[PDB]
């Protein structure tokens, strides 16, 4: 399976708990937000991702930020 897009697992930490999500390394933040929103049953408009000391939004990309497998993201709902 020599596919360019490799699924990566990112540990999402939230005020409620932490959960690891698996998504394509070339996935977008919006896609990741959708996955997280489902697990936490939250909204992508209320939850904000944090990484590299900067807030990650839909305009941002996972790989663009250097978020690969075995990474730790900070989810902030508010």
């Amino acid at each position: 399976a020599p596919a360019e897009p490799k699924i990566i697992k990112v540990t999402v930490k939230t005020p409620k708990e932490k959960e690891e999500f698996a998504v394509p390394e070339n996935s977008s933040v919006q896609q990741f937000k959708e996955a997280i929103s489902k697990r936490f049953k939250s909204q992508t408009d209320q939850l904000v991702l944090i990484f590299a000391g900067k807030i990650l939004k839909d305009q941002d990309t996972l790989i663009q930020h250097g978020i690969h497998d075995g990474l730790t993201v900070h989810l902030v709902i508010k």
């Binding site: 590299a52 000391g53 990474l71 900070h74």
Partner: protein
């Protein structure tokens, strides 16, 4: 005065007036550091293995001089990057890039 100056960092300390955000970012930075440490120690661990497999010498100073001399020469002769001068990974990457017929953009910070 510190008070008037920098506006007493009233909002230059807790983004959006939320100390939590500052802590989240700090932790995020620390998380990256932890990962970086693992990679840093990983290279050291691998390097140690190479040293054990290979012979042992105390010509570290001489090696540093070679790297500095070759580094300056490499830049000047960037137009002609000899394979021998470059590392195996660099040579391998070059062949791989050609295979993809121009892998990646090949440019940093598009402008």
């Amino acid at each position: 005065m510190l008070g008037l100056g920098a506006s007493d960092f009233e909002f230059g300390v807790d983004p959006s007036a939320d100390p939590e955000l500052a802590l989240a970012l700090r932790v995020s930075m620390e998380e990256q550091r932890q990962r970086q440490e693992e990679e840093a120690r990983r290279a050291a661990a691998a390097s140690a293995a190479e040293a054990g497999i290979a012979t042992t010498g105390t010509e570290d100073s001489d090696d540093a001089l070679l790297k500095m001399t070759i580094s300056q020469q490499e830049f000047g002769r960037t137009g002609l990057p000899d394979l021998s001068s470059m590392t195996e990974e660099e040579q391998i990457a070059y062949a791989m890039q050609m295979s993809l017929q121009g892998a990646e953009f090949g440019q940093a910070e598009s402008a």
